[PDB]
């Protein structure tokens, strides 16, 4: 009872408290993403009968009551309105199947002991309930394992942004790969000098990239450039960004702050060095940069420089121009994030941690993420397509540890 | 009074059907676009007083807007809507408050309400506190704006309408609101001066028939994608890259060759249609209903152009399903017709021609220079096609 401390349980959390989880279809980088909301209220599955007596184990049919990311709340067939034995099932587990699997696999359907005496004719009860029903896709689990083969492997070398000096890259080696997240070890430190990120992270690049584009590098098998997420083509009418133009940018050393910034250098391939006004590289397609006045116009606190800030007044004092709004991609796809929705988020200041979190703001494309239990100084601005946010059940699906929603060490 | 057949009236049509017009702010290419933030409900103008005999003026306020047309109520009618009247804002006889005084004209009350008050000036001066009017130079700025840079006798290249893999020498016959009528040198052709179908002299030879910042691979021959069929704009078809020309242009065909720039809003990645619930027209043979890109790529032993190369980014462009506008019939581009926004799919609009079958519908980009606000024809002097299956 007390002795089995397995860590944060979303089921307990979301049973006490009526929360909505952001659905799987919100997150493009994640497994099951395409095969998704094939799942929803009322779908039937064959699942382990857990109130059985005898493994060689037995199965029973259950139906989706509610969804919470990858997790579904199931009710065994025959409980009807009795919610008292509803249980969560993560859809990436091996013991959930389509209707039909037992028969193919020479297994047996046995009612739960709880309700077994409700009917004699269980088989015809089930036939009536199953008419016109839907079930899991065939190959569901197969297709999932297949999408969870990743091209980054232990021992591939690459260039990563230097966490101690964000103006240069440094050499790092892949140590661990789990669900598309990477643990990188830095070639000139270690053993506890690492860096976690997603494999689509804007912070990593194939060896030789920094040199080709003009990014500073600490020091001069190699992950092949094909392995990396390539950036959106940017089309412009008229000129491009230029050294000196002013804008607003998420501070990469404080993701809670969007700041007054400057273009410091135009690199090749649409990459820019920007500084808060220590240089940091964003691609021009980056959702972490915005034109002057974006904060004021959207009800975000703009972090001014050292030290009442007004854009026109600033541009006059500094003898400067704002980057034209035409250069930015500000759009808003109908992403489906809503204020209040729960999810699992990387703590970007300490990215080995993935934590229970909440959407606190949706500002077109930008979410403000709050880590439940923690002060607002820990909140983070991220793009709605960030590879660093995950649905409910992702940590469970990939076997990663999820931090509970309390202010303590892990 | 019934001998006076002036053709299609937007006033009666919007009123009778309770229709709404897409605002001028949806259309970047049009006169008055830059000045449009100044036009809003409650704005005050000096306009001719029509309800008078012996040319005199009166103040009116904006009750409703429809593209360039405002519905006006003469000051002093108050809640009486019986004399509201439409006014196109590109016309000469609508003015900023103070125009009369400057031009030694007189403000005279409409004879319907004239006996409401003795002190009209006191009444007006009260109504006028804290109100807005037109910009001082509103018509000057427009007339300066409609002084077009392509002029008559000017020469360039157009896509061949009977044969789209080829351009064809043409000359500027007429200029009307940015639109050019061209006559081939080598039967006419209309387009906007921002047409992607027109190029400067030499351009055909410069490419082999914007800027672009990218990393890694570009578009490659044999890559598959979806594209609006130039020969049937109501269809978006399975298409193939045929040839990569220079400065970002691409020769495509339906699974003959047609040119699109890589930034074009008329090409999309494979599966765009099914993701967005648009009916994809599949290659002659397939049906869909059932067509499957997964299986088509497998079978044709082909790759899809990657998604990151397409210029897909979508503004709050402000078009909404149901909104009325004036659309060029792009299969017969001399015709500009009453039309409706029938679909908004990110950047892409399906335009429906009121009175015609769904087969005349056309897919166009939200920033297409070939769609115009209600009242644009009236403002430019062009003829509007009415909303009826009939000919001009
Ligand atoms: C949401 N993550 C919070 C972890 C904070 C831990 C750290 N010792 C302090 O400083
Ligand atoms: C939306 N305009 C319709 C034009 C159709 C005219 C042609 N003669 C027939 O076909």
Swiss-Prot record, chain A:
One of its GO terms (biological process) is negative regulation of DNA-templated transcription. Part of the E2F6.com-1 complex in G0 phase composed of E2F6, MGA, MAX, TFDP1, CBX3, BAT8, EUHMTASE1, RING1, RNF2, MBLR, BAT8 and YAF2. The chain holds residues 172 to 609 of 705 of the full protein. MBT repeats lie at residues 8-112, 120-220, 221-305, 309-405. GO terms for molecular function: chromatin binding; histone binding; histone H4K20me1 reader activity; histone H4K20me2 reader activity; methylated histone binding; promoter-specific chromatin binding; zinc ion binding. It comes from the Eukaryota. The modification Phosphoserine is found at residue 167. Keywords: Chromatin regulator, Isopeptide bond, Metal-binding, Nucleus, Phosphoprotein, Repeat, Transcription, Transcription regulation, Ubl conjugation, Zinc, Zinc-finger. It is found in: Nucleus. Putative Polycomb group (PcG) protein. PcG proteins maintain the transcriptionally repressive state of genes, probably via a modification of chromatin, rendering it heritably changed in its expressibility. Its association with a chromatin-remodeling complex suggests that it may contribute to prevent expression of genes that trigger the cell into mitosis. Binds to monomethylated and dimethylated 'Lys-20' on histone H4. Binds histone H3 peptides that are monomethylated or dimethylated on 'Lys-4', 'Lys-9' or 'Lys-27'. This is Lethal(3)malignant brain tumor-like protein 2. GO terms for cellular component: nucleoplasm; nucleus. The keyword Ligase does not apply.
């Amino acid at each position: 009872q007390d002795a089995l401390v397995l860590g944060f349980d979303w089921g307990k959390f979301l049973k006490d408290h009526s929360y909505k989880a952001a659905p799987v279809s919100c997150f493009k980088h994640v497994p099951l993403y395409d095969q998704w909301e094939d799942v929803m209220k009322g779908m039937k599955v064959e699942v382990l009968n857990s109130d059985a007596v005898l493994p060689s184990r037995v199965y029973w049919i259950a139906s989706v009551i509610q969804t919470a990311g990858y997790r579904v709340l199931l009710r065994y067939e025959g409980f009807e309105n009795d919610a008292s034995h509803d249980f969560w099932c993560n859809l990436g587990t091996v013991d959930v199947h389509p209707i039909g699997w037992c028969a193919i696999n020479s297994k047996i359907l046995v009612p739960p002991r709880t309700i077994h005496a409700k009917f004699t004719d269980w088989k015809g009860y089930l036939m009536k309930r199953l008419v016109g029903s839907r079930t899991l896709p065939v190959d569901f689990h197969i297709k999932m394992v297949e999408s969870m083969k990743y091209p980054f492997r232990q021992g591939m070398r690459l260039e990563v942004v230097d966490k101690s000096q964000v103006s240069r890259t440094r050499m790092a080696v892949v140590d661990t790969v789990i669900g598309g997240r990477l643990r990188l070890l830095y070639e000139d430190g270690d053993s506890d000098d690492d860096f976690w990120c997603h494999m689509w992270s804007p912070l990593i690049h194939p060896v030789g990239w920094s040199r080709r584009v003009g990014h500073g590098i600490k020091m001069s098998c190699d992950a092949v450039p094909y392995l990396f997420k390539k950036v959106r083509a940017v089309y412009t009418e008229g000129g491009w960004f230029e050294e000196g133009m002013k804008l607003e940018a998420i501070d990469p050393l404080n993701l809670g702050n969007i700041c007054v910034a400057t273009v410091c250098k135009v690199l090749l391939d649409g990459y820019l060095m920007i500084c808060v006004d220590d240089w940091f590289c964003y691609h021009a397609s980056s959702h972490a940069i915005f034109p002057a006045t974006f904060c004021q116009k959207n009800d975000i606190e703009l972090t001014p420089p050292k030290g009442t800030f007004n854009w026109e007044n600033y541009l006059e004092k500094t003898k400067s121009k704002a980057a034209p709004s035409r250069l930015f991609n500000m759009d808003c796809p109908n992403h489906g994030f809503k204020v209040g929705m729960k999810l699992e988020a990387v703590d970007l200041m300490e990215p080995r941690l993935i934590c229970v979190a909440t959407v606190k703001r949706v500002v077109h494309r930008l979410l403000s993420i709050h880590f439940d239990g923690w002060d607002s100084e820990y909140d983070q601005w991220v793009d709605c397509e960030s590879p660093d946010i995950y649905p409910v059940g992702w940590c469970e699906l990939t076997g990663y540890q999820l931090q509970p929603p309390v202010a303590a060490e892990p």
